[PDB]
Design an enzyme around this catalytic site. Structure first.
Site, PDB file in Angstrom:
ATOM      1  N   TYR A 193       6.342 -19.407   0.504  1.00 56.07           N
ATOM      2  CA  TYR A 193       7.793 -19.361   0.289  1.00 56.07           C
ATOM      3  C   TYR A 193       8.636 -20.616   0.490  1.00 56.07           C
ATOM      4  O   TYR A 193       9.317 -21.059  -0.441  1.00 56.07           O
ATOM      5  CB  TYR A 193       8.415 -18.236   1.134  1.00 56.07           C
ATOM      6  CG  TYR A 193       7.704 -16.914   0.987  1.00 56.07           C
ATOM      7  CD1 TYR A 193       6.852 -16.440   1.982  1.00 56.07           C
ATOM      8  CD2 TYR A 193       7.837 -16.164  -0.177  1.00 56.07           C
ATOM      9  CE1 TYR A 193       6.143 -15.251   1.815  1.00 56.07           C
ATOM     10  CE2 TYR A 193       7.138 -14.981  -0.356  1.00 56.07           C
ATOM     11  CZ  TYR A 193       6.291 -14.529   0.638  1.00 56.07           C
ATOM     12  OH  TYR A 193       5.581 -13.373   0.425  1.00 56.07           O
TER      13      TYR A 193
ATOM     14  N   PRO B 166      11.929  -9.616  -4.177  1.00 59.34           N
ATOM     15  CA  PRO B 166      11.688  -8.329  -4.835  1.00 59.34           C
ATOM     16  C   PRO B 166      12.971  -7.523  -4.972  1.00 59.34           C
ATOM     17  O   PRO B 166      13.865  -7.611  -4.127  1.00 59.34           O
ATOM     18  CB  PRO B 166      10.687  -7.634  -3.909  1.00 59.34           C
ATOM     19  CG  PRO B 166      10.025  -8.761  -3.173  1.00 59.34           C
ATOM     20  CD  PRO B 166      11.186  -9.700  -2.910  1.00 59.34           C
TER      21      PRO B 166
ATOM     22  N   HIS C 276      12.151 -12.690   0.340  1.00 53.18           N
ATOM     23  CA  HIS C 276      10.769 -12.504   0.781  1.00 53.18           C
ATOM     24  C   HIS C 276      10.229 -13.270   1.987  1.00 53.18           C
ATOM     25  O   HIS C 276       9.278 -12.819   2.618  1.00 53.18           O
ATOM     26  CB  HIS C 276       9.825 -12.749  -0.400  1.00 53.18           C
ATOM     27  CG  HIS C 276       8.681 -11.785  -0.472  1.00 53.18           C
ATOM     28  ND1 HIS C 276       8.058 -11.286   0.652  1.00 53.18           N
ATOM     29  CD2 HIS C 276       8.040 -11.241  -1.533  1.00 53.18           C
ATOM     30  CE1 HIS C 276       7.084 -10.473   0.284  1.00 53.18           C
ATOM     31  NE2 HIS C 276       7.051 -10.427  -1.035  1.00 53.18           N
TER      32      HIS C 276
ATOM     33  N   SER D 102       1.107  -4.691  -5.989  1.00 47.88           N
ATOM     34  CA  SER D 102       1.283  -4.208  -4.629  1.00 47.88           C
ATOM     35  C   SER D 102       1.736  -2.765  -4.653  1.00 47.88           C
ATOM     36  O   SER D 102       2.321  -2.287  -5.630  1.00 47.88           O
ATOM     37  CB  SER D 102       2.323  -5.036  -3.864  1.00 47.88           C
ATOM     38  OG  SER D 102       3.635  -4.735  -4.312  1.00 47.88           O
TER      39      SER D 102
HETATM   40  C1  LIG Z   1      -4.017  -1.248   0.670  1.00 42.03           C
HETATM   41  C2  LIG Z   1      -3.136  -0.109   1.213  1.00 42.03           C
HETATM   42  C3  LIG Z   1      -1.914   0.070   0.292  1.00 42.03           C
HETATM   43  C4  LIG Z   1      -3.938   1.194   1.220  1.00 42.03           C
HETATM   44  O1  LIG Z   1      -3.146   2.247   1.804  1.00 42.03           O
HETATM   45  P1  LIG Z   1      -3.714   3.731   1.975  1.00 42.03           P
HETATM   46  O2  LIG Z   1      -2.691   4.530   2.689  1.00 42.03           O
HETATM   47  O3  LIG Z   1      -5.075   3.640   2.563  1.00 42.03           O
HETATM   48  O4  LIG Z   1      -3.796   4.230   0.435  1.00 42.03           O
HETATM   49  P2  LIG Z   1      -4.758   5.450  -0.048  1.00 42.03           P
HETATM   50  O5  LIG Z   1      -4.374   5.751  -1.451  1.00 42.03           O
HETATM   51  O6  LIG Z   1      -6.173   5.116   0.241  1.00 42.03           O
HETATM   52  O7  LIG Z   1      -4.295   6.691   0.878  1.00 42.03           O
HETATM   53  C5  LIG Z   1      -3.129   7.443   0.505  1.00 42.03           C
HETATM   54  C6  LIG Z   1      -3.276   8.932   0.887  1.00 42.03           C
HETATM   55  O8  LIG Z   1      -4.521   9.447   0.292  1.00 42.03           O
HETATM   56  C7  LIG Z   1      -5.436   9.833   1.378  1.00 42.03           C
HETATM   57  N1  LIG Z   1      -6.868   9.529   1.042  1.00 42.03           N
HETATM   58  C8  LIG Z   1      -7.463   8.317   1.047  1.00 42.03           C
HETATM   59  N2  LIG Z   1      -8.745   8.458   0.676  1.00 42.03           N
HETATM   60  C9  LIG Z   1      -8.960   9.747   0.440  1.00 42.03           C
HETATM   61  C10 LIG Z   1     -10.074  10.479   0.031  1.00 42.03           C
HETATM   62  N3  LIG Z   1     -11.234   9.865  -0.200  1.00 42.03           N
HETATM   63  N4  LIG Z   1      -9.966  11.821  -0.130  1.00 42.03           N
HETATM   64  C11 LIG Z   1      -8.805  12.453   0.092  1.00 42.03           C
HETATM   65  N5  LIG Z   1      -7.720  11.770   0.487  1.00 42.03           N
HETATM   66  C12 LIG Z   1      -7.774  10.426   0.666  1.00 42.03           C
HETATM   67  C13 LIG Z   1      -4.929   9.081   2.599  1.00 42.03           C
HETATM   68  O9  LIG Z   1      -5.284   9.826   3.780  1.00 42.03           O
HETATM   69  C14 LIG Z   1      -3.439   9.126   2.402  1.00 42.03           C
HETATM   70  O10 LIG Z   1      -2.948  10.419   2.766  1.00 42.03           O
HETATM   71  P3  LIG Z   1      -1.368  10.709   2.819  1.00 42.03           P
HETATM   72  O11 LIG Z   1      -0.902  10.918   1.428  1.00 42.03           O
HETATM   73  O12 LIG Z   1      -1.271  12.116   3.593  1.00 42.03           O
HETATM   74  O13 LIG Z   1      -0.735   9.644   3.636  1.00 42.03           O
HETATM   75  C15 LIG Z   1      -2.680  -0.408   2.665  1.00 42.03           C
HETATM   76  O14 LIG Z   1      -3.824  -0.610   3.499  1.00 42.03           O
HETATM   77  C16 LIG Z   1      -1.772  -1.641   2.722  1.00 42.03           C
HETATM   78  O15 LIG Z   1      -2.237  -2.768   2.895  1.00 42.03           O
HETATM   79  N6  LIG Z   1      -0.480  -1.372   2.558  1.00 42.03           N
HETATM   80  C17 LIG Z   1       0.554  -2.404   2.577  1.00 42.03           C
HETATM   81  C18 LIG Z   1       0.677  -3.075   1.196  1.00 42.03           C
HETATM   82  C19 LIG Z   1       1.871  -4.021   1.201  1.00 42.03           C
HETATM   83  O16 LIG Z   1       1.962  -4.918   2.040  1.00 42.03           O
HETATM   84  N7  LIG Z   1       2.774  -3.788   0.245  1.00 42.03           N
HETATM   85  C20 LIG Z   1       4.028  -4.576   0.095  1.00 42.03           C
HETATM   86  C21 LIG Z   1       3.746  -6.016  -0.321  1.00 42.03           C
HETATM   87  S1  LIG Z   1       5.273  -7.015  -0.408  1.00 42.03           S
HETATM   88  C1  LIG Z   2       4.658  -9.705  -5.075  1.00 41.76           C
HETATM   89  N1  LIG Z   2       3.468 -10.440  -4.655  1.00 41.76           N
HETATM   90  C2  LIG Z   2       2.293  -9.575  -4.771  1.00 41.76           C
HETATM   91  C3  LIG Z   2       3.301 -11.597  -5.529  1.00 41.76           C
HETATM   92  C4  LIG Z   2       3.626 -10.919  -3.270  1.00 41.76           C
HETATM   93  C5  LIG Z   2       3.706  -9.759  -2.269  1.00 41.76           C
HETATM   94  O1  LIG Z   2       4.986  -9.124  -2.383  1.00 41.76           O
HETATM   95  C6  LIG Z   2       3.574 -10.332  -0.847  1.00 41.76           C
HETATM   96  C7  LIG Z   2       2.143 -10.715  -0.488  1.00 41.76           C
HETATM   97  O2  LIG Z   2       1.205 -10.061  -0.998  1.00 41.76           O
HETATM   98  O3  LIG Z   2       1.952 -11.667   0.313  1.00 41.76           O
END
Ligand SMILES: CC(C)(COP(=O)(O)OP(=O)(O)OC[C@H]1O[C@@H](n2cnc3c(N)ncnc32)[C@H](O)[C@@H]1OP(=O)(O)O)[C@@H](O)C(=O)NCCC(=O)NCCS
Ligand SMILES: C[N+](C)(C)C[C@H](O)CC(=O)O
Length: 599
Positions: free
Chosen positions: A81, A94, A317, A528
């Protein structure tokens, strides 16, 4: 955040050298030619040999982890950034579209805005009192530092690199927010003398004064300056604050807890592209002729309240990722739904200070240059919003499959169906289980994902065989995800080795100048997931000229999708990508439904 919490959290680890290089080669196979892979394979062996370059760089990183709370923190903040010179608008900040409100008149618009402000001040209460609940990402406590960076903060333009100011924990914490109406900024206190927060009704009365103090758009849209190239804005900014009044106004804006944008009516557009336009309104403002001048893009948090019921926000961001932001949104939105009670009479309030701006011929020129720059940016942006109503996390879960992996695999299928090949793909992974952790990279284009997309469109492969390939791709993605959130991914590690080399004053290893690394870090698909209880959706522009920016909010019964692209690249089309993604998701459900597991 709460010291007791942050200390008990583990420090960001430094993955093993051979381990990361191993994953690197694997993630490259599906996106690079065999010839390039063989070459890269050679570089890696040398790079990690005993007494070699890589070994020395690795030791440096481990020493770094011993001398710092987080070995990656500062490096990431700067390269991602502070040193990114492109405009923050579209390319970095964003945008967010919140659920449309039902207010019909200006009174309701302000009524909602006041409720929103109060909601944010309520969330802030937990921040100042360190009572903010502990979060987990899988039985592991998460860093809360990001929550103490979003309020009362702002980005500051710098000639070489930008900086950030945080007044939350200053001697005399700011007790005012800033409101922008028709390009005019106003300083508004949201706290009483005793220290109690103003009520929705009180804030409303003030917003009313503010609105009437800027009924016309006759002032220069100084705020539009913030949307220009960072180098350009740095110089315009330095000149802008030479005037005592201007400097005073900018200062209030930077210190304000957050900014509220009261947007004006915009030219009604076709219903079929309405959502895409609202998305544009939240991401960049629509243009110098609409709402782009009614903002200050350096401000960490900007909440936007349109006059047609639409609302959303855009955030700088450098401060945080989406999760902390949405946590704030879910709280505020749920707060705006809280019934009313004792509407007792309130005593007179002071007149919100109008942050004047003395315009000069030089400033005027900068503003005009900013308008032109933004026009080019906007016209080149291709956005398509897609509400996937067919299903949500519900189907994948019933199939015992990770929804996120299901969606990511769907995207890989869609891309392949269009281009006939896989591409470097980026998906945000949260590293908040570690102190000051931000993110790492999950690479959705893998050996298993490619094996699936190929077999899927293969008219010679049994439908049952495609199912196995599908589950294997999803599982491979879930595995990568588990490793990423545990600091076992390799992207940030490789970046660190490169930065360590620079710092060590040693020649840049070939592995980093290798064509393969160039392809690997050129993300045609940047994505994301931003889960939220609120039926909202986020969006951002692509990270490369010939790529797409895709964000989504997987709900239980539907998924909110946003797809961006650049018109400068004829090979990309937002609408087309969105269509293929919708169809890839449906086709995958059809494949699994055609072949049940149980019996
Ligand atoms: C990568 C990431 C998104 C994965 O998240 P996650 O919650 O594990 O996503 P999943 O799709 O695997 O799980 C979602 C749901 O399905 C469920 N699930 C996962 N695997 C399953 C399976 N095999 N069978 C049934 N259910 C399952 C989870 O328990 C969860 O349940 P919920 O709906 O009751 O909460 C997370 O680890 C992460 O890094 N999030 C942040 C991303 C971020 O920074 N975004 C903004 C960027 S600026
Ligand atoms: C939008 N994007 C994926 C480029 C950056 C994310 O928002 C932040 C990150 O993944 O570090």
């Amino acid at each position: 955040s709460h010291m007791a919490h942050q200390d008990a959290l583990p420090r960001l680890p430094v993955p093993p050298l051979q381990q990361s290089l191993d994953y690197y080669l694997k993630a490259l196979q599906p996106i690079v030619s065999e010839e390039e892979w063989a070459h890269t394979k050679q570089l890696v062996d040398e790079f990690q040999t005993s007494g070699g370059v890589g070994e020395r760089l690795q030791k440096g990183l481990e020493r770094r982890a011993k001398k710092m709370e987080n070995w990656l923190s500062e490096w990431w903040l700067k390269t991602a950034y502070l040193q990114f010179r492109q405009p923050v608008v579209i390319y970095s900040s964003p945008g967010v579209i919140l659920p449309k409100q039902d207010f019909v008149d200006l009174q309701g618009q302000l009524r909602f805005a006041a409720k929103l402000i109060e909601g944010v001040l309520d969330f802030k209460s937990m921040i100042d009192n360190e009572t903010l609940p502990v979060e987990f990402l899988g039985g592991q406590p998460l860093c809360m530092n990001q929550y103490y960076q979003i309020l009362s903060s702002c980005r500051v333009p710098g000639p070489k690199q930008d900086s950030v100011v945080n007044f939350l924990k200053s001697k005399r914490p700011p007790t005012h927010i800033t409101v922008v109406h028709n390009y005019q900024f106003f300083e508004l206190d949201v706290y009483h003398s005793d220290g109690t927060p103003l009520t929705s009704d009180q804030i409303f009365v003030q917003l009313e004064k503010i609105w009437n103090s800027s009924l016309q758009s006759n002032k220069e849209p100084v705020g539009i300056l913030t949307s220009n190239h960072r180098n350009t804005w740095a110089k315009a900014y330095n000149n802008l604050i030479k005037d005592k009044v201007n400097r005073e106004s900018v200062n209030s804006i930077q210190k304000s807890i957050f900014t509220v944008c009261l947007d004006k009516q915009v030219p009604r557009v076709s219903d079929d592209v309405y959502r895409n336009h609202v998305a544009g309104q939240m991401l960049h403002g629509g243009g110098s002729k609409f709402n782009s001048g009614n903002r200050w893009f350096d401000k960490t948090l900007q909440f936007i309240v349109a006059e047609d019921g639409s609302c959303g926000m855009v955030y700088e961001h450098a401060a945080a990722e989406g999760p902390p932001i949405v946590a704030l949104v879910d709280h505020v939105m749920e707060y705006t739904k809280k019934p009313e009670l004792v509407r007792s009479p309130m005593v007179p309030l002071p007149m919100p200070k109008k942050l004047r701006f003395n315009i000069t011929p030089e400033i005027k020129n900068d503003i005009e240059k900013a308008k032109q720059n933004l026009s080019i940016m906007i016209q080149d942006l291709d956005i398509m919003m897609l509400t996937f109503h067919h299903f949500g996390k519900d189907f994948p879960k019933s199939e015992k499959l990770s929804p996120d992996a299901f969606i990511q695999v769907a995207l890989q299928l869609a891309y392949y169906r269009i281009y006939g090949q896989a591409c470097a793909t980026y998906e945000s992974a949260s590293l908040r289980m570690f102190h000051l952790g931000r993110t790492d990279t999950i690479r959705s284009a893998s050996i298993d994902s490619l094996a699936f997309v190929k077999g899927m469109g293969d008219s010679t492969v049994p439908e049952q065989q495609k199912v196995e390939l599908l589950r294997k791709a999803v599982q491979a993605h879930r595995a990568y995800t588990d490793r990423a959130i545990r600091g076992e991914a390799f992207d940030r590690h490789l970046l660190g080795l490169k930065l360590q080399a620079i710092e060590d004053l040693v020649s840049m290893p070939d592995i980093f100048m290798d064509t393969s690394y160039a392809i690997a870090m050129h993300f045609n698909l940047s994505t994301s997931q931003v889960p939220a209880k609120t039926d909202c959706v986020m969006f951002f522009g692509p990270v490369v000229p010939d790529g797409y920016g895709i964000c989504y909010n997987p709900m239980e019964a539907h998924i909110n999708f946003s797809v961006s692209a650049y018109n400068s690249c004829a090979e990309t089309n937002a609408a087309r990508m969105a269509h293929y993604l919708e169809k890839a998701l449906l086709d995958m459900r059809t494949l699994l439904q055609n072949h049940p597991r149980a019996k």
